[PDB]
Design a protein around this ligand. Structure first.
Ligand code: SF4
Ligand code: SF4
Lengths: 232, 89, 344, 32, 50, 232, 32, 32
């Protein structure tokens, strides 16, 4: 079942429907950007649509192909955004072509927007009735000088991933630096090529036996010292 | 006259990868469970095979490797390599 | 004959002369594979169907004395193959061509090979030289995919030191781990016999896959179609993406004050330098420094060549600008006598 | 009018078949 | 020794009273075309990895 | 880079170009035929086009889909020739359906044809300015009473070929007769079967051991006599 | 109108290709 | 007319898909 309130479900029974409104939120905090709020249309005052107090500005956005299924391939709906004045290209050249971000689609009925969107003022406003979905941007299939097409995907979709992440190595580590297994917290001692530096900005392990010996954590080495198992 | 439907395909090719657009990438062999967990090399054959199905191979440098045996035969040797030094006792 | 197979030193101009000698060079090994009687598909294609000069350039580039991890000096790629199983010729050719990071193409009625060697610009394109479709914009860009961008690679190489057994070497980047996800990919390093070569191949794959991430397709008139043969390097300067005025065909010019009358409102640099490049008679790229823009519309060049008539296209180059390069990969010919170019 | 429409539809169908093959060869699906 | 054809042998230790001995003789095909000889003199031949 | 001369490269950029002429040469000499010159167009005097001195007769022809690529399958452009009066059928039944021949496509700008093609006489004539391509016919996909369609392919195409072309061993030889590896140059002694003969017309080798015994040439036999290695 | 016709042909060339893929792999086809 | 055009486009799409399957399975391509 869905988290649909009783009031909106009851309203979604009558013949004389209201106007469906779709609003989009592009979240880039996890990738290094900001939160952008878009709406396909504006109110009667020629103003950004106000919902839950926040404002969605008008911009041509169109999402097509939302197909949830359990078999076959995954779902890859398409989002089209007008690229005029180079606005999309500006963030694309900066945010690595909008790869890894999140998109949230909220759909609302017209009779529940804030009262400031209507000259008479809606008395039926209720800023808690909407339907929410989230997806992740996969690629920018085409961004011309007039438009831009993004492919969407489910966050939990598996593609190109293998289950047994463990890999057996001979003289190379397998985990990160200082994360969980390299319980190192002392001063910087080494760098990429195992040089005796003492600066923290250049401290990165070489993923070798010599790096471990330098950092005195050879007891936590991921590379088994077999090597000569296939020669004999 | 006109030649419509160009249908640019720059986007479709990248769908399989970008490094493949400049390099065909090396082929990889399959894994036989019977051959334990060893990985077969595509350019070296240490084991000495049988001269039949396997095509006459080619060498390109170093690589102590096996062969394709054409004739194996075991008999009784002679007592003495040559010359007049032919002692037995 | 010019090639010494011991120290790998070239001395003089090379002619179409071959001598029998021992070698372990990858390019010439491929050349032997392509053309040879008996087993080397010699009865199918002649010796004149393959670009031997491209092979010579590849072989010259192969031996560059890259620095190894052990402090030694070794050639970049060493040919070591023992083919002992029958398989499709196309597959063997692709495996050979994947080591030296090359690609074969039927260019100029000859089979030639191209690689990602840093080269010079060949030709320039802007809005005037390209044609837009009914949509409105002529350049169509595209990018790679999140899960398509590999950053962890395992390479299988034979290890003569221990037992001539296979060994897997891993290469990855921490910053790519932080930015994108972890994408693991396996590929054997065909012909590898040293850890340094396998590591170099993996590093090349990850770096090429991380940096080259943009592909643009567009269209070009007849002149450009005849000009670019295939797999060349050209600049695609676009004022739409650059939110500036990159330059286009100038209308008329003069000779006394060298008053060049363009058709777009240009904009000079702040305080350092700026140049503009036009074409001449023998289709060169004549560059001229610019001092002052008289009337925001008219240009004053220093020494213009009296060969521009009306259709010369000018490109205006400022400083501190990341000039955009492109390598053409796909070229399509249609009956309207225009060409479709898809480049990276 | 005539064979122009036929050629147009033929190219469009070929492109669609290429896209279908690509999308069905992927991890999910029937692995064509 | 290299060039196109070569031969070699090791002095056998044998004899010590009348007996009989076996002799395994086997021919192997390595590759095709004019190949170069072994890198070394004669110790390139490896029987049971020695 | 291409081998196009400077002057034609300069002219191709002109805003007011001239006509583009395409001329085709079909060469069957490697198969046992002749050289045919075709041009889709003629001059203003209703005469075959004269280029470099030779004459390309007017005849229906049209090439389509000329593509060059480095990835995927090798491109196969097509050629269409009108088969009226049975002209194509006249050679199809004689030259084994034009399989194995060569086609040469030369493109030329109209302002460089010989002066005899123009009533006033072209003064800007240069018989060394053209662009040349060559392909090989693969199959005749369609042949009717109105037309004929040929498929073209690159000479270097590697479809249906295996790299190492040796069978190693058998009871039979695996070479040619009187080549540069069999090394036989004597008088005729044997025929297709194991029958004595003394005529050069029916000299044939069964490529078995008996043939070698007949020809006193066994040291050049390309079959290793193992047999029992597979059994024992 | 153009784009409606193009989208119609594109979507029509989808299930056709899918059915072709499915039938050519059943018993005696080319297995896609 | 509707149904005739629909059946014609469907059959043409099937032919195109078959041709694409045949042409992509030669030596290279994506090897469908
Ligand atoms: S190698 Fe030793 S030090 Fe470097 S990361 Fe792995 S464990 Fe931590
Ligand atoms: S069999 Fe003996 S004779 Fe007949 S071809 Fe082979 S080698 Fe020459």
């Amino acid at each position: 079942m869905q988290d649909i309130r009783q009031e909106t479900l009851n309203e979604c029974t009558r013949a004389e429907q209201s106007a469906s409104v779709v609003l989009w939120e592009i979240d880039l905090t996890e990738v290094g950007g900001e939160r952008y709020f878009f709406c396909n249309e504006q109110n009667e005052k020629g103003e950004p649509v106000t919902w839950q107090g926040r404002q969605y500005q008008p911009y041509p956005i169109q999402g097509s192909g939302f197909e949830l299924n359990g078999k076959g391939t995954s779902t890859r709906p398409t989002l089209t955004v007008s690229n005029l004045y180079g606005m999309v290209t500006g963030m694309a050249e900066d945010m690595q072509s909008l790869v890894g971000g999140t998109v949230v689609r909220r759909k609302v009925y017209a009779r529940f927007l804030d009262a400031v969107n209507f000259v008479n003022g809606n008395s039926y406003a209720d800023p808690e009735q909407e339907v929410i979905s989230r997806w992740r941007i996969e690629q920018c299939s085409e961004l011309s000088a007039v438009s831009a097409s993004f492919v969407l995907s489910t966050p939990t979709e598996t593609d190109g991933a293998v289950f047994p992440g463990r890999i057996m190595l001979a003289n190379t580590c397998t985990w990160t630096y200082r994360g969980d297994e390299c319980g190192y917290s002392g001063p910087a001692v080494a760098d990429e090529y195992d040089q005796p530096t003492s600066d923290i900005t250049k401290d990165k392990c070489s993923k070798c036996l010599s790096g471990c010996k330098f950092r005195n954590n050879v007891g936590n080495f991921g590379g088994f010292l077999s090597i000569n198992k296939l020669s004999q | 006259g006109m030649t419509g439907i160009l249908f640019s395909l720059g986007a479709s090719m990248v769908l399989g990868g970008v490094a493949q657009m400049l390099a065909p990438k090396a082929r990889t062999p399959r894994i036989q469970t019977t051959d334990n967990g060893k990985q077969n090399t595509y350019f070296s054959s240490l084991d000495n095979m049988v001269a039949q199905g396997n095509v006459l191979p080619v060498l390109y440098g170093e690589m102590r490797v096996g062969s394709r045996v054409v004739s194996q035969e075991i008999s009784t040797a002679d007592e003495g390599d040559g010359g007049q030094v032919v002692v037995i006792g | 004959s010019n090639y010494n197979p011991q120290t790998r030193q070239y001395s003089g101009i090379w002619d179409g002369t071959f001598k029998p000698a021992y070698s372990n060079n990858m390019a010439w090994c491929l050349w032997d594979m392509l053309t040879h009687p008996r087993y080397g598909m010699g009865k199918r294609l002649g010796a004149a169907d393959v670009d031997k000069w491209a092979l010579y350039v590849i072989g010259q580039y192969c031996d560059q004395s890259v620095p190894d991890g052990f402090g030694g000096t070794e050639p970049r790629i060493t040919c070591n193959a023992y083919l002992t199983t029958q398989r499709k010729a196309w597959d063997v050719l692709s495996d050979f061509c994947s080591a030296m990071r090359c690609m074969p193409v039927w260019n100029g009625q000859t089979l030639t090979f191209v690689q990602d060697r840093p080269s010079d610009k060949t030709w320039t394109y802007n809005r005037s030289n390209v044609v837009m479709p009914d949509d409105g914009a002529p350049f169509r860009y595209s990018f790679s995919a999140l899960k398509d961008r590999h950053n962890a690679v395992e390479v299988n190489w034979i290890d003569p030191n221990n037992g001539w057994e296979t060994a897997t070497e891993l290469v990855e980047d921490t910053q790519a781990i932080a930015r994108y996800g972890r994408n693991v990919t396996k590929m054997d390093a065909f012909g590898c016999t040293s850890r340094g070569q396998a590591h170099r191949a993996g590093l090349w794959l990850i770096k090429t896959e991380l940096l080259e991430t943009q592909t643009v397709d567009f269209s070009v008139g007849a002149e450009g179609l005849r000009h670019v043969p295939g797999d060349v390097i050209e600049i695609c300067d676009d004022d739409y993406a650059g939110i500036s005025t990159g330059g286009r065909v100038l209308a008329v010019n003069s000779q006394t004050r060298t008053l060049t009358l363009d058709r777009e409102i240009t904009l000079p640099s702040s305080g350092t330098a700026l140049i503009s490049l036009v074409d001449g008679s023998g289709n060169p790229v004549s560059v001229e420094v610019q001092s002052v823009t008289d009337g925001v519309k008219v240009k004053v060049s220093r020494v213009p060549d009296g060969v521009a008539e009306y259709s010369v296209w000018e490109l205006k180059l400022p400083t501190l600008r990341q000039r955009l390069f492109r390598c053409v990969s796909i070229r399509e010919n249609d009956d309207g006598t225009y060409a479709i170019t898809a480049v990276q | 009018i005539g064979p122009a429409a036929l050629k147009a539809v033929y190219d469009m169908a070929r492109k669609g078949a290429r896209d279908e093959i690509q999308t069905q060869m992927r991890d999910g699906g029937l692995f064509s | 020794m290299g060039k196109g054809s070569s031969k070699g042998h090791t002095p056998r230790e044998a004899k010590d009273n009348l007996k009989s001995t076996q002799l395994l003789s086997v021919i192997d095909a390595i590759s095709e075309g004019p190949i170069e000889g072994p890198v070394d003199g004669l110790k390139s031949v490896l029987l049971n990895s020695t």
